[PDB]
Structure 1
């Protein structure tokens, strides 16, 4: 569904509070886009549905390492 591939973020739920304090149910959705990452040790782009916070992790930890974590936990990207 709407779940970040590299971090596992999924939709959550909360409330809208109006000025009279009326509460109605809502959802908070992750900010996730499609993006192709250059993989050097495979010479091809890999496309993932990662969130914007998931791209900061890829920039920091690298992409080869992040793909290894997905491989271990049975992620078919």
Structure 2
């Protein structure tokens, strides 16, 4: 489903207030894309569907640290 595999960001819900203040149920989707991340210590790519906030977290913490606790949680890659 549309959850980031790094952050767990799924879709959330809210409203669509008009100028006459009609509220309508919409939904807020994460900016999740597919990205291949190079791991040196495995000599391959892993391809995980992450948000852009997850991309920034990979940039800050390293792919090895995030890929360590993806599998403690028990994700695919």
- The two structures have a TM-score, normalised by structure 2, of 0.97
Divergent runs of 4+, >6 A? none
State how far apart, in whole Å, the 2-side matches of 1:57 and 1:35 are.
13
What is the CA distance between 1:71 and its match in structure 2? 1.0
Structure 2 residue ranges without an equivalent (≥5): none
What is the CA distance between 1:74 and its match in structure 2? 1.0
Structure 1 residue ranges without an equivalent (≥5): none
What is the CA distance between 1:67 and its match in structure 2? 0.3
Q: What corresponds to 2:22 in structure 1?
A: 22
Deviation digits for residues 25-68 of structure 1 (CA, Å, limit 9, x no counterpart): 00000000000000000000100000000000000000011000
More strand as a share of residues: 1
- The two structures have a TM-score, normalised by structure 1, of 0.97
State how far apart, in whole Å, the 2-side matches of 1:60 and 1:28 are.
25
